[PDB]
Amino acid sequence: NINENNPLLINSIKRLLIGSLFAGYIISNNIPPTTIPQMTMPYYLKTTALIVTIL
Amino acid sequence: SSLPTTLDPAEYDISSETRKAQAERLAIRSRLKREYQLQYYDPSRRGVIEDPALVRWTYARSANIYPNFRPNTKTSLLGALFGIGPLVFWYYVFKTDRDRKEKLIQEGKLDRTFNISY
Amino acid sequence: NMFSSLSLVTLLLLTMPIMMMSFNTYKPSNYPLYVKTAISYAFITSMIPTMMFIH
Amino acid sequence: XXXXXXXXXXXXXXXXXXXXXXXXXXXXXXXXXXXXXXXXXXXXXXXXXXXXXXXXXXXXXXXXXXXXXXXXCQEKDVLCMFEAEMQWRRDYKVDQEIVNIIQERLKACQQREGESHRQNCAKELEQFTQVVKAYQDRYXXXXXXXXXXXXXXXXXXXXXXXXXXXXXX
Amino acid sequence: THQQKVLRLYKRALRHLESWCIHRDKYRYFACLLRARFDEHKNEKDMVKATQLLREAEEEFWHGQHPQPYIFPESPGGTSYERYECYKVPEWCLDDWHPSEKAMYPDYFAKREQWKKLRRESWEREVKQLQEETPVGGPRTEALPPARKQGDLPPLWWHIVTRPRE
Amino acid sequence: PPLTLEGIKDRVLYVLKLYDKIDPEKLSVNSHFMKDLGLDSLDQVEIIMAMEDEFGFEIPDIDAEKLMCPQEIVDYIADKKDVYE
Amino acid sequence: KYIIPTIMLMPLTWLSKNNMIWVNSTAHSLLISFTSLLLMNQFGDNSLNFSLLFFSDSLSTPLLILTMWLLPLMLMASQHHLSKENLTRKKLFITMLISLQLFLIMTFTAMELILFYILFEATLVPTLIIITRWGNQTERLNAGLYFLFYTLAGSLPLLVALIYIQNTVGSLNFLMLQYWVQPVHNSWSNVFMWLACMMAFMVKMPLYGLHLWLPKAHVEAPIAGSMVLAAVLLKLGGYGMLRITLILNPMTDFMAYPFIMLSLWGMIMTSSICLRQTDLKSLIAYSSVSHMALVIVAILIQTPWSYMGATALMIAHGLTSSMLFCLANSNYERIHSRTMILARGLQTLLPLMATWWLLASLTNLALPPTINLIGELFVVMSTFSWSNITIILMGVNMVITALYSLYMLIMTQRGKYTYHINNISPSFTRENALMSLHILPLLLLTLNPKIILGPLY
Amino acid sequence: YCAHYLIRFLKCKRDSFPNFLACKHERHDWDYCEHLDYVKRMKEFERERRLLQRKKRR
């Protein structure tokens, strides 16, 4: 069984890696928002979303 | 539709009289195969062969309309209930919708303000 | 004014291989590379009017 | 021009107060692409305008007015009704496109305000309700396919219903 | 064909075991457990009990029957490239090549003329050889191999001896 | 990847020798698994499953009865995969 | 200007030598089709008048152009067929197609109800001879007998209807004269007056009942898949429904209400049967019932939107279904049996034809706006103003229109063709020409079909 | 609802500044009044709960 590295595969995915790591830092930061509800319930709603993925 | 488990290793006779009948299946199969084999491997053929099994298959659906159905039984009347039935079904659907609409135009206006269409 | 002019270019660039598909110019093996090069410059001509929108 | 409503005045002026970086990249490209192919296309349009020189006049739309209405012409006659049927059909083709102009006025109302849209305007939505309601009750919209004789019956049906309501109240 | 019924059930049991297990070392452990089941009962001759065990073998096989079976490579039917990456141009299309275009690669055209000449000349001998081997009326299920193969050419080859590949 | 006639004789022999059911001196190339090598009825299906998984698993039950000799099994695997021109 | 060039096409075939024939019949019809597109497209405020009533004018007829477009297209398809037959019979046959097109020019141009009807029935006799002779299949006589049994029993009631109306109110003749129209008061004597005018165009415009007229004419085809385009012209030949409903009876349309309902099941149940059937021509024949049922639903509503959709659909079906019959012709000329299961496999033998299969099948569905979407979408939007529940019935039809096209594709996409030794040669120059001359006018009508869907548009 | 602090964030966005990320002071001021507005809605729910408790006792 052989799995070789291709010059076409590396240059395609590496440029997508910039797009996958730097998407929310550019797009959602520059786009105009309308009413943010992030204020109420830090231990019951805000932290629970990240903790569910950990659990 | 199959009712119990998927039928493949279930319900079979243990090498009884069915073995003589199963050997007869290959005898007729090869009889139709050998005449197919002789009319295939020649370079001077050029053309699609008949195969009478598929010719009679088309004849079973396209023809056999009036040679069949000469005893018009109660099952045909049950098929007629699925025939005329649905056509008379919508008569009490569209009219009830129309009499709902037409009465709303005359008394207690329900017409749209921006309706330039039709 | 340039926002309206450059917006249709993205629609035009993608249709150019379709318009030059039936014979047109003798290009074997280069045609799959022609699709890649057409979209690459279509990305640049789409990045500029989005910067106009954020502005 | 004239028939189109349009915006009153366009605002916007460059500020550039916060940060330096590389100024405005969009404005830098705006000056760059103005001479790149926007100036070349303007020069080509001027060259095509100069090459025109002599041009045909073309007397535009023909008039043809009145010629007696179908309501004035009493009793059925093929010689009299024919010109009346053409007059009603010409008006119906115009009245179709009158709605289309006010339809595009409402299209301009949506864009030229954007954020407000429903809260502002107030005139274009009111003008739309004044014309469409008049178009719905008088110019077919319920009388199926277009016919001049059917329109006179439709006008009489609306008049008889209005007279019965006015006399009672 | 009772011997075939045991083999087909055992072949299905091995290829269905890999779908349930995850690792290769666990696959070897359960296979030896299956070898402890079938080899112990096949040693003694049974007339009624052997068919009774085979009908009982339907159970356990049906209790664990569908976890989506691992038909990973190019297998007949099932899943994952059954009859795929196939242009498969037949020999019938290889005869209708247009002039001023068939001249390109002349070695393929010159060889195919010799193959067609070999088939046309041997067909009369193949019809006699194939027509000779007959039990009475119709064949008894099976192909006809060459008996008196002096020169060469079996009775019935072109599609069988001329596959497109893959 | 391309497959050769020498490759089919090398891959099948290495898979058969690694099975440990039969000795390397007992089975070479032409010694049949049915009588000469010394393999059971359950072993015939086990050797066929192991040889298929190593190269390209496309062995039907109908061809499993015909597959008894390793020289014939290497030829049947080459015929189905269309190997060696 | 359209009288005596088609009549001058008649001595052309007889006078020309045996080596030519086909070269003259096609070339001296393509330039005639050019003049139809040159002159007839002009319109004023309303309907014009080209001449005194021998052949009148156009009101909402770009459908005349379609017949002129099929004037050489039938001669294109019947090239492999009638190649081994007698040279005198070739001259006899082309004149019979010309005579069909001669009366078809007359029927669309003449704005009468009396002159129209007798030349509407003058298309029946040439088609009868074209079906009952050169028919490749047995029992073609049933396709001939029922052709005149279903049509004439419904159309002869027009003689007792049309003459009755002109005896009471002026004369039907000039049509633009006929605006002396009195509203029908809905009486029991007027019940059969409406029915007799409709039943004549309930046969050629196939409903659910009395629809067996169509598939028998297609299965027992006149010529392979070549003269079927004339039977497509007979489907759109029931355009008198556009004129009768508008002029003769506008008030009483309470009797139209059951006929829409009868054609509503002539949408679903006519598409259900067109799923299992073995004959490839019959899979076009039963699909042609449903697409022409759309018009019968539309016209009887009488809303201005339905007329826009109907007139588009008459032109849409005339170039899409006929194109599908040309694909059925190309398969039948090689295999010589129209079995769908037997003829299986494209791209392995026919690579270029497979793209033409797509541009003809997918047009049954609502593609990027060709004329079929423009035809269908206006009708569906017209049925909602009639009643809200219609789209539930119409939506099922939208699913089975995909079961028309893709099922025709999949049963030809399956690459096998093991038994087939024939179909060695891919396609002739005239064979691919039929695929182009049917689809490229549909592709040109994507841009601006203003001069297609035009009853006051 | 806030308007006064929210317009300042739009005023920061009114100026170009390529690759916009360094404007947090206007965003924090907009979030400060929004948290106060959320607290005012929470106090209104608390006052409604306090009024319901007094009504249940009497």
Q: Answer whether G45 sits within 8 Å of D93, measured CB to CB.
A: yes
| Min Cα separation D12/chain G (Å) | 39
Contact indicator for G237, G107 with CB cutoff of 8 Å: yes
Rounded to whole angstroms, the Cα distance separating D157 from D140 reads 12
| Cα F29–Cα F31–Cα F35 angle in degrees, nearest 5 | 155
Are the beta carbons of B118 and D142 separated by less than 8 Å? yes
Tokens of E35: 């070898």
- Closest by alpha carbon to F16, among F26, F3, F4, F1? F26
Closest CA to G193 of G123, G131, G108, G255: G255
SS (H, E, C) B13-56: CCCCCHHHHHHHHHHHHHHHHHHHHHCCCCCCCCCCCCCHHHHH
The DSSP H or E segment spanning E108 is: helix E106-132
DSSP-derived 3-state class of residue G240? coil
According to DSSP H, which parts of E43-105 are helical?
49-56, 58-61
- Resolution of this structure in Å: 4.1
Q: How far is CA G103 from CA G123, G126, G145, in A?
A: 6, 10, 22
Q: Which domains are seen in chain F, by residue range?
A: 7-81 (1.10.1200.10)
Q: Which residue of B has its CA nearest to E154?
A: B41
CA gap B44, E117 in Å, rounded:
11
Q: What residues pair up with D23 in beta bridges, in sequence order?
A: D21
Hey, are the CB atoms on D145 and G304 less than 8 Å from each other?
Answer: yes
Tell me how far apart the alpha carbons of residues G397 and G263 are, in angstroms, rounded to a whole number. Answer: 12
Residue E55 CB contacts under 8 Å (≥ 6 apart), including other chains: B9
In chain F the first and final C-alpha atoms are separated, in Å, by 14
B and E touch with 3+ CB pairs <8 Å, answer yes
For the question of residue F40 being annotated catalytic, the response is yes
d(CA G259, CA E59): 60
Residue type at B115?
N
G348 CB near a chain E CB, below 8 Å? yes
φ, ψ for residue G100 (rounded to 5)? -60, -50
Q: How far apart are CA D31 and CA D25, in angstroms?
A: 10
Q: How many CB atoms lie within 10 A of CB B85?
A: 9
3-state secondary structure of F45: helix
Tally of residues, chain E: 166
Compute and round to an integer the Cα radius of gyration of chain D.
Answer: 27
* Tokens (6 digits) for G77: 């398809």
What is the C-alpha separation between G108 and G2, in angstroms, rounded? Answer: 12
Contacts of H2 (CB under 8 A, 6+ apart): H30, H33, H34, H37
CB contact under 8 A, B40 and E159: yes
CB-count exposure of residue F62 (10 Å: 0-12, 13-18, 19+): exposed
∠ CA A17-A22-A27, nearest 5°, is 135
> Chains with ≥3 Cβ pairs under 8 A against F?
E
DSSP string, B53-73: HHHHHHHHHHS-SSSS--S--
What six digits make up the tokens of G385? 């103003």
After which residues, if any, is chain C broken (C to N > 2.5 Å)?
Answer: none
Report residue D57: phi and psi, to 5°: -75, -60
Which one, of G412, G421, G416, lies nearest residue G336 by Cα? G421
Say which DSSP state H4 is in: T
Task: Mark which residues 10-69 of B lie under 8 Å from G by CB.
Answer: 40, 45-49, 51, 54-55, 57-58, 61-62
Closest in G415, G417, G425 to E96, CB measured: G425
User: 10 Å Cβ neighbour count for G68?
Assistant: 24
User: What is the H or E stretch that residue G317 is in?
Assistant: helix G304-335
Compute the distance between CA of residue G263 and CA of residue G241 in angstroms, rounded to an integer: 15
Task: Please tell me the distance from the alpha carbon of residue C50 to that of residue D50, in angstroms, as a whole number.
Answer: 37
Which of F10, F23, F40, F53 is catalytic? The answer is: F40
Taking alpha carbons only, the member of F42, F53, F41 closest to residue F15 is F53
Long-range CB pairs of D121-128 (<8 Å, 24+ gap) are D124/D5, D127/D102, D128/B114, D128/D102, D128/D103
DSSP class of G212 = T
Residues F1, A39: Cα–Cα separation, whole Å: 60
CB H35 within 8 A of CB A36: no
G80 burial via Cβ count (<10 Å: 0-12, 13-18, 19+): middle
Q: Where are the alpha helices (DSSP H) in F1-85?
A: 5-17, 41-55, 61-64, 70-81
Q: With beta carbons less than 8 A apart as the criterion, state whether G383 and G390 touch.
A: yes
D166: left (phi over 0), alpha (psi -120 to 50) or beta: alpha
Rounded Cα distance between E127 and B42, Å, is: 10
Provide the token pair at D161.
């219903």
Q: Scanning the structure block, which residue is given the tokens 């423009």?
A: G374
Looking from the CA of G356 toward its CB, the CA atoms found within 13 Å total: 23
Q: Tell me whether C47 touches chain D (CB under 8 Å).
A: no
The answer to whether the CB of G114 falls within 8 A of the CB of G172 is: yes
Q: Is the Cβ–Cβ distance between G202 and G156 less than 8 Å?
A: no
CA distance A41 to D138: 60
Residue corresponding to tokens 């004149």: G95
Q: Residue E149: is it exposed, middle or buried by C-beta count within 10 angstroms (0-12/13-18/19+)?
A: exposed
Residue the block writes with tokens 């979209």? C39
CB contact under 8 A, E42 and F58: no
Cβ(G391)–Cβ(G383) below 8 Å: yes
Instruction: Of G10, G22, G138, give the one whose Cα is nearest residue G82.
Output: G22
Our CA-based measurement puts residue C53 at a distance from the nearest CA of chain H, in whole angstroms, of 11
Structure tokens belonging to residue E156: 């019935």
Q: How far apart are CA G222 and CA G127, in angstroms?
A: 8
- Do G251 and G183 meet the contact criterion of CB atoms below 8 Å apart? yes
Whole-number Å distance between alpha carbons of E85 and G155? 58
- Distinct helix (H) and strand (E) counts, chain H: 2, 0
CA neighbours within 13 Å on the CB side: how many for C42? 16
The maximal CA–CA distance of chain B, rounded, in angstroms, is 84
In angstroms, the CA G178 to CA D147 distance is: 12
Chain D residues with CB-CB distance to G454 below 8 A: none
DSSP string covering D37-61: THHHHHHHHHHHHHTT-S------S
Q: What residues are paired with D21 via a beta bridge?
A: D23
User: B27, E130: Cβ pair inside 8 Å?
Assistant: no
Give the number of beta-carbon pairs within 8 Å between D and H.
23
DSSP letter for E98, please.
P
The DSSP annotation for chain D comes to --SS---S---------S--BTB-HHHHHHHHHHHHTHHHHHHHHHHHHHTT-S------S-----S--TTTS-S--HHHHHHHHHHHHHHHHHHHHHHHHHHHHHHHHHHTT-SSTTSS--SHHHHHHHHHHHHHHTS-SSS-S--HHHHHHHHHHHHHHHHHHHHH-
Which residue has tokens 């500020």?
A: D15
